[model samples]
Target: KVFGRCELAAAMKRHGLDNYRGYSLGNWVCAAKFESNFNTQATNRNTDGSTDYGILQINSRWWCNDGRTPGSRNLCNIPCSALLSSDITASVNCAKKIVSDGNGMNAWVAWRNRCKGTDVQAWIRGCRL
Candidate 1:
């Protein structure tokens, strides 16, 4: 499921991600934009043979297990398939764990390259919620 930008931000706000770990809902919204363009089923193969899955592009090497990553820690303790679903419950929880793990939102490289540097308020400016 690909989410419209405003729709995704509203969803994140409803999920209680606003100000989570010192990052606002806009921060996560922006991350989703640069990471996967809010595409829930997005997936990518990494050079290390691990895979990235879902909207936030959670990584297999450290956050989830697709049963094939060479050094998967599966730290989120969920199948990578869970991230691919549109429900987003597991993906949200996994992302929370990652941010809580001392990396904050920096765990996502896209966040650093784009989301972290922008005026994220504009990302959610059109949303009524």
Candidate 2:
């Protein structure tokens, strides 16, 4: 398994799913690798003494604030980790809501194409039970 039991379980628990029954980890990993190379300790400094960090590239300074809870961070404020903590359906639904104004899964399909690049069907080839 790409992700350890605890990690996958944590992710599923946060997103409300059984193991391997949650959202597409391959999709999430591809996006994270493209965006930040899965670097959990990564940070981008803000002028206000804040930063973004982790594989999800969460902006802790803005998302994890004094009055806000950890999971309060939205897509704009904290993308990757937020996804981990959010319901899988809700997250994809939200993306779909904005991707084409409730049109289709084109955005996700596009992302899959981009991530697979020369081999657009790589997801199927590489991911299987």
Residue 96 C-alpha lDDT in model 2: 30
Q: Which ten residues in a row have the lowest lDDT in candidate 1?
A: 8-17
Q: lDDT of model 2 at residue 107? A: 35
Kindly give the stretch of ten consecutive residues in candidate 2 with the minimal lDDT sum.
16-25
Local accuracy of candidate 1 as per-residue lDDT tens digits, 6-95: 888878887878898889888999999888989999999999999999999999999998989875698889999999887878888898
Q: What clash pairs does model 2 have? A: 40-54, 56-80
- On a 0 to 1 TM-score scale, where does candidate 2 land against the true structure? 0.37
Candidate with maximal TM-score: 1
Segments of candidate 1 deviating more than 4 angstroms: none
RMSD of each candidate relative to the true structure: 1.0, 8.1
Q: What does candidate 2 score in Cα RMSD to the true structure?
A: 8.1
lDDT tens digits by residue: candidate 2, 1-129: 134323533453454332222234444445445544544444455465545444444444334432333434343433444434323333333343333434322334434555644442333343333
